[PDB]
Write a protein that binds this ligand. Structure first.
Ligand SMILES: Nc1ncnc2c1ncn2[C@@H]1O[C@H](COP(=O)(O)OP(=O)(O)O)[C@@H](O)[C@H]1O
Lengths: 67, 436
């Protein structure tokens, strides 16, 4: 077995990747349980993550491809 | 404060001094001895400056003139985070340690190192803890929902957190503080979910903090002396710590001060009734203040020209001459009528309910006549016999009853003198029988 277009596909990394905030992009210390959104701190949480208008969480996760 | 009942020096909340060190006539529970109180304020400002090492002060005077009150006032006005060790003259005669060793330990307990450390702490309320405990092997997994007033988040937990949460069994709604570095959770309590209680934690989970640590040099000496652990600090079997580990700790402390990750806080060592120390102890104190890491020693004595223990000659204040040379002396005087009235007023105000004014005058007259301490001890028993009469105030006749019952020193001495054969003398002669 050998292929060209599929054997040059890069395999997933063995080192665990760095976690980042979804809306700001710093360290996501916390992830909201209901929203599944990585967020940096409290004012980010209560200012963006709580009053977010529904359907925006999927396009949030679409950047990381978790939608 | 821990558990504190009413004691002798309980009214003293510090030196009653202004900003220019001039003593107020009555402030912070202390009245009188204004020259001595100004001197104690100057010594307090010395210790608070912290640039002067190894001075000795000698608080000498008549008994019951407030020397221990002055030292307790200095200790109260110093506040916390500055070490204070109050020992007596009979403590250092140890059955296991030598005299100079006990003096060295007491010297090094009053020198402190201040270290600022920044740690990590996560503290919140557990909304819900789940564990997917499908243990096909040793691996297990679970998730934790932790909430504060401004946080609500879910965590993915590794195996060691599952082990740490199996013990110290956290239910939903409990308040926990997690140290991520050491993996030690503390169950502060349960939040307001009754339907011991603690308030729900405020926002900003994962908040670093600075906990300022002050340890004495004696604890570092006990730790660095390798065969004694920190259990020697509680058990007391430190057992003749060697000089080389002390020298190593002094060099390390100088290195820490120079490189700036530790600050040294000088303290005060108080020796009550210093006249009971031997001449060997006076020699070690005589040569112990020349070390740079030596505290400000306070000594209090109430003896005249007396013998020095371990010798046979007499010396002033019960101390040898070179130790008197290496110390400045604070003098204290006795109290007149108004000072006795003010002291009894303050002690009766704190200790119990109010007195009638003629009873307070009778207390002041008795305190002038016999002793201040005898009147202060008469206050409480007069109040108790007033409660036995079922009256709120303390009258003159309750004081008369307590004066009839509880004798002072002079009446006891006199009554011993008229009844001599009933008692046992130096030669062990006593007439127990009453007939002929
Ligand atoms: N200036 C003062 N202000 C308030 N209380 C005092 C004062 N002087 C002495 N006392 C009180 O007198 C009692 C005995 O005094 P003490 O401290 O034993 O004197 P000394 O230290 O000279 O032996 C203590 O309860 C103390 O509170």
């Amino acid at each position: 077995p050998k292929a060209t277009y599929f054997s040059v596909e890069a395999p997933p990394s063995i080192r665990p990747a760095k976690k980042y905030c979804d809306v700001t992009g710093l360290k996501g210390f916390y992830k909201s349980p209901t929203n599944n959104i990585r967020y940096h701190n409290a004012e980010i949480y209560q200012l963006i993550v709580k009053p977010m208008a529904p359907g925006v969480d999927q396009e949030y996760l679409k950047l990381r491809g978790a939608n | 404060k821990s558990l504190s009942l009413i004691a002798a020096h309980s009214h003293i909340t510090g030196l009653g001094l202004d900003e220019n060190l001039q003593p107020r006539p009555t402030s912070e529970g202390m009245v009188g001895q204004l020259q001595a109180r100004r001197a104690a304020g100057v010594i307090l400002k010395m210790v608070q400056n912290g640039t002067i090492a190894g001075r000795a002060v000698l608080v000498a005077g008549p008994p019951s003139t407030g020397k221990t009150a002055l030292a307790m006032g200095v200790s109260q006005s110093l506040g916390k985070d500055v070490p204070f060790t109050a020992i007596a003259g009979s403590e250092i005669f140890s059955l296991e340690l030598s005299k100079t060793e006990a003096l060295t330990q007491a010297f090094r307990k009053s020198i402190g190192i201040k270290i600022k450390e920044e740690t990590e702490l996560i503290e919140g309320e557990v909304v819900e803890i789940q564990i997917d405990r499908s243990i096909t092997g040793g691996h297990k997994q679970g998730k934790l929902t932790i909430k504060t007033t401004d946080m609500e988040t879910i965590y993915e937990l590794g195996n060691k957190m599952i082990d740490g949460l199996t013990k110290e069994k956290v239910l939903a709604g409990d308040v926990i503080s997690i140290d991520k570095a050491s993996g030690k959770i503390t169950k502060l309590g349960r939040s307001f979910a009754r339907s011991r209680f603690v308030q729900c934690p405020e926002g900003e989970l994962q908040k670093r903090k600075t906990v300022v640590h002050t340890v004495s040099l004696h604890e570092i000496d006990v730790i660095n002396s390798r065969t004694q652990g920190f259990l020697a600090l509680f058990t007391g079997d430190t057992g003749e710590i060697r000089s080389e580990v002390r020298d190593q700790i002094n060099t390390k402390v100088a290195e820490w001060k120079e490189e700036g990750k530790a600050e040294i806080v000088p303290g005060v060592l108080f020796i009550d009734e210093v006249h009971m120390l031997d001449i060997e102890c006076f020699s070690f104190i005589n040569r112990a203040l020349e070390d740079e890491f030596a505290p400000i020693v306070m000594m209090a004595t109430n003896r005249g020209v007396s013998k020095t223990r371990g010798t046979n000659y007499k010396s002033p204040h019960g101390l040898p001459l070179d130790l008197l040379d290496r110390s400045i002396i604070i003098t204290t005087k006795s109290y007149n009528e108004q000072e006795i009235k003010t002291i009894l007023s303050i002690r009766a105000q704190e200790e119990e309910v109010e007195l009638s004014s003629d009873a307070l005058d009778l207390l002041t007259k008795t305190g002038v006549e016999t002793s201040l301490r005898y009147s202060s001890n008469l206050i409480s028993v007069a109040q108790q016999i007033a409660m036995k009469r079922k009256n709120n105030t303390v009258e003159v006749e309750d004081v008369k009853r307590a004066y009839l019952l509880f004798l002072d020193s002079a009446r006891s001495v006199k009554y011993v003198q008229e009844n001599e054969s009933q008692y046992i003398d130096d030669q062990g002669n006593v007439q127990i029988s009453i007939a002929k």
